Design a protein around this ligand. Structure first.
Ligand SMILES: NC(=O)c1ccc[n+]([C@@H]2O[C@H](COP(=O)([O-])OP(=O)(O)OC[C@H]3O[C@@H](n4cnc5c(N)ncnc54)[C@H](O)[C@@H]3O)[C@@H](O)[C@H]2O)c1
Ligand SMILES: NC(=O)c1ccc[n+]([C@@H]2O[C@H](COP(=O)([O-])OP(=O)(O)OC[C@H]3O[C@@H](n4cnc5c(N)ncnc54)[C@H](O)[C@@H]3O)[C@@H](O)[C@H]2O)c1
Ligand SMILES: NC(=O)c1ccc[n+]([C@@H]2O[C@H](COP(=O)([O-])OP(=O)(O)OC[C@H]3O[C@@H](n4cnc5c(N)ncnc54)[C@H](O)[C@@H]3O)[C@@H](O)[C@H]2O)c1
Ligand SMILES: NC(=O)c1ccc[n+]([C@@H]2O[C@H](COP(=O)([O-])OP(=O)(O)OC[C@H]3O[C@@H](n4cnc5c(N)ncnc54)[C@H](O)[C@@H]3O)[C@@H](O)[C@H]2O)c1
Ligand SMILES: Cc1cc(C)nc(SCc2cc(C(N)=O)no2)n1
Ligand SMILES: Cc1cc(C)nc(SCc2cc(C(N)=O)no2)n1
Ligand SMILES: Cc1cc(C)nc(SCc2cc(C(N)=O)no2)n1
Ligand SMILES: Cc1cc(C)nc(SCc2cc(C(N)=O)no2)n1
Ligand SMILES: [Mg+2]
Ligand SMILES: [Mg+2]
Ligand SMILES: [Mg+2]
Ligand SMILES: [Mg+2]
Lengths: 268, 268, 268, 268
């Protein structure tokens, strides 16, 4: 009697035990969902990481920049879940921006090839995954992507923020297409989460000024949040993704749910 | 094993079997919640209506314009739920705007006394109820109010839209106060629902032009909604309110969840 | 050859030489506009203040809560400007919230009578003035109101923020009515301005905590603003109001122009 | 005594006499501005078109996808305006999306190479131009870009809408950089304009369904606009761009001004 009992859900984006997708996968399994996982490039690493999940789940390779991986994806998922079975859910928890597009590298100094790669992975791939998976999704189904509120510019995030603005726009169009299948498409805008990369950035991996700026942003976020914000805890974000994967928000689509402690609703 | 098992929830706003609050109360009970209901003025009528709910629930009188009703409310709820017990949820499903403030009566012709009454009932009362109930709410608790997207002006709704804009602002402040109790505060922005009053308006109860305009708005809403919009079905709205009353959106506060078929995310 | 040469403009809201309306009136006159001023209650004081403006301007009494003042307003303006002449512009620079609705007084402790008075003056009066003045405005005309961005809740501002949210909604409806006259209606959302009342608040006139909170908000505003924000200088705000009164934004209506140093477009 | 007397302004984006940039250039010249024009690929055509402007203006080649054109741009402008002189204004009126990214071609069928080209030209180039031109702009200067409101998804526009969402995000970051030079950066969100390409689209150049959908969008736009919307008249848009190029909106940056007849503020 979990929130997601009997649901078949694809979860992309696990790389480490601190990935937001690891926690989404863990909570979905705690809630009775049967998962299919997708991983990029380091499959041996991802398998060892996913071995820590409450239940076993088939892992499929998916490089979103690879058209062959996308073209074979639905067939590979069908084989993993069994012929005649379809997905009820899809989680996009994929994001990347080359170092030139984030941090202390001046915003104007990011070459377009780098920005384009980041936009391909972080925004266009949300449409790529929906195109590949909608033909194998059941009516009442749900597609969820991870967002970081890009409504206002912020230091260091730079082109990653531009990619999120593009992602929010993509989500509204994916919802139009997904609707033809009786499927919802939404994003969860999370507050900052101390993933391995976020800790490294605050530690100065992308320059001192950028680290200092992200640390101030994190502190301000918890201060603004009426219920507080714990950057070390991805569970509230994972629960929110599961809320969207469930039958409990059936009239919400092309939309954004903020799992940010309410920080975006307050100025100070 | 319902979504709201063991939760004690107050639900205001039932007047007819077509009230959005009736459906919120029905779904909350189907999901294991123990309810306390509040009713305005016509208690005998409300009791006969609520007798149709899946389970028995104490009904308390609450006129939000009456300071004595508000001052005695927490004590009356405690008596109904038993000393030592507190509420986990509160539903505000209250709205009113005198006839001069809605319909064919020109927007400029609404006297302030009428607008002020409508704003008192539809917006200020969200803060009034939170003030009365927060001292008897448990941490992890949830306050939910009903909204109708007032981001853009629309024909006929007139001062009711102004009252909703004020309500959205009130919600952000209530979240600040509710946070001190470990309580969330959010609104559900519903698409148009064919309540008794909505059917009467489309039928011309507030003038021909206003009826024609609201009918066009309803049609456009379903056309824009990527998953469609059924104005005759309050169930998707009721489910969304229950999603907010549950433990599944724990990092969302001072916010608005749109249960509108995704219509507000599309232009055409 | 001023920006507003030959335009007849009504300007309300002058009380001191630090009123935003004093600077709007000064810049409009520097730009060739012929003004009619309205004042509340302290006409002798207002006249002595307005004697400092670059040019002489008739001053009319206007209490926005007084229906007789509103009913006689168009006739009184016509007498001041001459029969056969109409206004090209109207400036609403009126705002009030009783002490219980702002500052350290808890948000929940503001009685409705106080909130309603504040909403009457700060929001409903924008519609009251447009109703009175549209019959004496020329096509191509412009109505401008003063806003303080209420999209996110903030400390101390409390019910004044709720009143601004209501004002933004009122503006969108006033635009619908004003359009029938070929008239535009818009708000200027200013950054914080050190008026006499703002200085008194920071100084602790409405409690220590509220003063400290508003001082932090002011500092954050200049820090966020990509071009900086000088709270001691109302000139950039006055220039923006004149931009809206001019023929230079002819396709903008029911809208909000932010004269806030760009602070609302940045998170940090 | 024009609005832009003595200002040196670069205007990009003229291709035909129906280009929005042609009208921006015409109004800026009527208002006393001294222009430098940039053109893409068809310089002989652009020169013959620009010969119709009120005054002579040097024309420089600028392909925004060409790093050499961008690297030599400031030097070429300085040569055209004279050593010791700098620009007061910059107009970005550049947009492109390959046919696969707009129209009847399904949203999912646009290959990334096409989307990336469109995003390069329509969004990234706003940052490219600011990087090249800020070192030759005077304090008090203004950068203006052309936007088409992408807040909600719409039929046919597809990836062009995604590119506009990315552009709005880019604008907020450009404002941060431009602020260091005492320069403002803003976008004008225009209503639909019957350029040669728009007429061809409505005529079915990108498929019947797309043409029909854009025609419905145009009709709805004028219906919603409280002051109406004339798609055959770029003058109100050109005037708005000049308002931003002037000294009259000195505290507005990282922002969006809507020259859309107020259509985006109304639902119906
Ligand atoms: N960490 C935060 O503060 C934060 C905040 C809000 C939203 N988000 C978003 O959450 C999502 C997950 O990120 P995270 O913070 O868990 O970091 P992460 O590094 O753990 O997850 C990013 C994932 O993207 C994958 N990926 C990269 N390139 C790929 C490709 N070519 N094909 C397929 N997958 C590819 C990586 O392998 C990794 O699994 C991202 O969309 C991120 O932007 C993160
Ligand atoms: N019907 C729609 O299309 C629609 C759309 C979105 C949101 N909403 C909102 O949903 C909520 C419920 O409205 P509904 O559509 O179910 O209509 P309804 O008439 O069934 O419910 C309104 C309720 O407000 C109560 N109320 C009025 N004055 C009161 C007072 N002084 N004290 C206490 N309660 C008082 C009424 O008794 C009634 O129970 C309202 O906030 C409404 O604005 C309605
Ligand atoms: N000061 C700021 O930081 C700030 C920021 C943004 C917007 N604004 C807005 O600018 C406008 C002008 O305020 P200000 O800051 O110049 O303060 P102010 O005190 O100088 O101006 C407020 C004016 O409202 C008038 N008023 C009050 N009650 C009235 C009534 N019954 N009838 C008619 N007029 C009445 C007062 O007489 C006064 O002239 C207000 O709308 C205010 O909210 C102020
Ligand atoms: N037409 C509308 O309905 C509408 C509405 C709102 C905003 N806009 C925007 O206004 C701007 C001007 O477009 P328009 O409608 O006048 O169409 P247009 O075709 O007349 O202008 C587009 C311009 O972009 C130029 N361009 C394309 N690729 C380029 C490159 N590689 N380098 C440099 N310049 C390049 C073209 O040469 C052309 O001059 C665009 O940003 C467009 O999206 C248009
Ligand atoms: C909002 C947000 C913040 C961070 C640090 N990573 C992410 S996605 C993960 C990631 C890592 C990198 C990188 N440059 O290593 N780029 O993207 N998204
Ligand atoms: C958004 C929306 C629409 C309607 C018809 N009623 C409501 S609340 C119910 C109601 C009824 C009335 C009335 N004038 O009878 N005023 O308010 N809210
Ligand atoms: C946004 C903003 C801020 C302030 C201090 N005053 C205003 S209007 C002026 C005013 C003064 C008072 C008062 N309580 O004296 N209420 O309103 N508006
Ligand atoms: C919002 C909007 C609408 C249109 C028709 N063109 C533009 S920019 C001009 C353009 C033309 C094309 C094309 N595919 O020919 N792509 O972009 N922008
Ligand atoms: Mg294991
Ligand atoms: Mg019964
Ligand atoms: Mg004098
Ligand atoms: Mg010529």
């Amino acid at each position: 009697t979990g929130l997601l009992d009997g649901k078949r859900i694809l979860v992309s984006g696990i790389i480490t035990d601190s990935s937001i997708a690891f926690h989404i996968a863990r909570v979905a399994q705690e809630q009775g969902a049967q998962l299919v996982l997708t991983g990029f490039d380091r499959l041996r690493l991802i398998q060892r990481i996913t071995d820590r999940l409450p239940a076993k789940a088939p892992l499929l390779e998916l490089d979103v920049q690879n058209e062959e991986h996308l073209a074979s994806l639905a067939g590979r998922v069908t084989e993993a879940i069994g012929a005649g079975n379809k997905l009820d859910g899809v989680v996009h928890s994929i994001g990347f921006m080359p170092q030139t597009g984030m941090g202390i590298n001046p915003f104007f100094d990011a070459p377009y090839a780098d920005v384009s790669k980041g936009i391909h992975i972080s925004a266009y791939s949300y449409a790529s995954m929906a195109k590949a998976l909608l033909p194998i999704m059941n009516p009442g189904g749900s597609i969820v992507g991870m967002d970081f509120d890009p409504s206002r510019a912020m230091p260091a995030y730079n082109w990653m923020t531009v990619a999120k603005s593009a992602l929010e726009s993509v989500n509204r169009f994916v919802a139009r297409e997904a609707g033809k299948y009786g499927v919802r498409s939404n994003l969860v805008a999370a507050g900052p989460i101390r993933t391995l990369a976020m800790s490294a950035i605050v530690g100065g991996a992308l320059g001192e000024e950028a680290g200092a700026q992200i640390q101030l942003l994190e502190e301000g976020w918890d201060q603004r949040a009426p219920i507080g914000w714990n950057m070390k805890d991805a569970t509230p974000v994972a629960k929110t993704v599961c809320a969207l994967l469930s039958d409990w928000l059936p009239a919400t689509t092309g939309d954004i749910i903020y799992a940010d402690g309410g920080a975006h609703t307050q100025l100070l």
